[PDB]
């Protein structure tokens, strides 16, 4: 029976995992996968669990220091960067008054590069050759069985062996490294990382092999050629994949979606499997197909709240006419502009509108008490909180059960888009316009026919529109499940 880890498989744990698979994961659309990230009690290991309907669960425990840049150090650098980013947002008006807009811009460019580098280093050091656990590639058993035969050959040739069989999930890590036939592709370090893993799994399960007696570099070359064979065949004969992250309390502050290996891919977060299951069982079908897996929100009857505190003039200017022309006039949207929404107005929008667009400061919590979002029979609205730190993490970067996002999720909002830290009006508006175009709320070309990406796909693509991919766009995240706009729906 196939080994997947360098440690004892505990029967109670495996039973629990199989019960979770049966009662939660087997309801999840098969083209979606669920990945949990947490730290070991020690803090030394990143624990990754990958779950998908019709697939065996995969549990990974990655020691961050297996090769200084430990978790404490990475998180500290992230929080310092965020603090400096937030400060550039608050000092915008001030710097402009001092005639120093250029130095201000340069500071933001420098922070953008610093955050990019941190994410590069996380992917390189922490994930290393395991980054493929995040791969959205379609599984192809026939191709995998070929790769298995070639890879088992590599082991026979270079190990002694001169017995333990690997789970397919371990082999999928190799496949998940990416297209090996790409010009300039170099997986040597990654492959080394995974070959150590395989030797360790073997060692633990009774097939011992000394590191110094293995020619890893020869194993790397042959494995890469095997992956080139795999990907050559996969590319020759060519999904709506979505990833859903479940994150431990201290890991929401990390912009996972902006790691090199997740950039541009459709990724959302969910607070718990319980929240996931609730949202799935509440899904609305399209008025009229992998898209049938999502929640379908009618375009008609939304609410927008634009510049509620009146000081976001640039934002009002950017969207007011577009929203009038495309939403309020033909699609029966409720318009609240340059005045605060009342709490009853806000609640009524959550209850009755399929889509709520909030273009104001923060999460809007200044306008609606948390406890009344919990009294709601149902939060019908998919909610876009296009504002500074609208996810409302604590000063220490923690995601709390009392925060707005948890409250919306518990109330049943199909999705909530928000920001992990402070962002400028101009640059988050670029992102927001991108979301609305890609999602199909606005026509293509508005911001410069009609697209129909899921909200999650639209968020991932709209990151491209920001001047700063990291200082701005990486703040943006979506909690919930894929939502599609139903243009003719009611």
């Amino acid at each position: 029976l196939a080994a997947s880890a360098p440690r004892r498989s505990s029967l109670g744990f495996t039973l629990d995992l199989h019960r979770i698979q049966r009662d939660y994961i087997d309801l999840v659309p098969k083209h979606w996968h669920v990945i949990s990230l947490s730290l070991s009690d020690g803090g030394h290991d990143l624990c990754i669990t990958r779950l998908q309907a019709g697939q065996a669960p995969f549990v990974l425990r990655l020691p961050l220091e297996r090769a200084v840049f430990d978790f404490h150090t990475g998180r500290a650098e992230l929080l310092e960067i965020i603090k400096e980013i937030n400060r550039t947002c608050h000092d915008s008006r001030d710097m402009a008054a001092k005639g120093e807009r250029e130095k201000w811009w340069a500071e933001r460019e420098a922070l953008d590069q610093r955050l990019k580098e941190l994410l590069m280093n996380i992917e390189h050091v922490w994930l290393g050759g395991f980054r493929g656990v995040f791969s959205q590639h379609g599984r192809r058993p026939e191709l995998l069985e070929k790769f298995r035969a070639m890879f088992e050959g590599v082991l026979d040739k270079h190990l002694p062996s001169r017995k333990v069989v690997l789970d397919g999930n371990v082999l999928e890590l190799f496949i998940g490294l990416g297209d090996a036939t790409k010009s300039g592709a170099d997986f040597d370090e990654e492959l080394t990382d995974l070959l150590y893993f395989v030797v360790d799994i073997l060692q633990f399960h009774g097939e011992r092999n000394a590191y110094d007696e293995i020619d890893f570099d020869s194993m790397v070359v042959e494995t890469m050629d095997a992956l080139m064979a795999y990907h050559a065949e996969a590319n020759a004969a060519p999904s709506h994949a979505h990833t859903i992250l479940v994150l431990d309390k201290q890991l929401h502050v990390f912009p996972w979606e902006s790691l090199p290996c997740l950039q541009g891919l459709a990724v959302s977060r969910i607070p718990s499997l319980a929240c996931l299951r609730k949202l799935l069982l509440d899904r609305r079908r399209s008025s009229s197909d992998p898209r049938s897996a999502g929640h379908h929100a009618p375009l008609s009857g939304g609410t927008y709240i634009l510049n509620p505190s009146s000081d976001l003039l640039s934002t009002q200017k950017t969207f007011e006419s577009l929203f009038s022309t495309h939403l309020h006039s033909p699609n029966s949207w409720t318009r609240i502009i340059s005045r605060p929404p009342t709490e009853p107005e806000f609640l009524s929008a959550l209850t009755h509108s399929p889509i709520l667009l909030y273009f104001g400061h923060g999460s809007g919590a200044q306008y609606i008490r948390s406890r009344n979002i919990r009294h709601l029979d149902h939060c019908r609205a998919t909610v876009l909180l296009m504002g500074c730190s609208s996810a409302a993490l604590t000063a220490k970067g923690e995601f709390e059960p009392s925060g707005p996002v948890w409250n919306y999720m518990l109330a049943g909002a199909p999705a909530v888009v928000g920001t992990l830290w402070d962002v400028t009006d101009r640059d988050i508006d670029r992102f927001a316009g991108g979301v609305l175009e890609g999602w199909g709320v606005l026509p293509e070309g508005c911001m410069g026919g009609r697209n129909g990406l899921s909200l999650v796909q639209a968020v991932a693509k709209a990151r491209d529109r920001c001047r700063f991919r990291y200082v701005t766009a990486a703040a943006a995240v979506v909690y919930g499940i894929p939502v599609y706009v139903d243009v003719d729906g009611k």
Partner: peptide, 11 residues
Amino acid sequence: HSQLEVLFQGP
């Protein structure tokens, strides 16, 4: 259900 607790946070 210790490494699985991350899946069952909150209420």
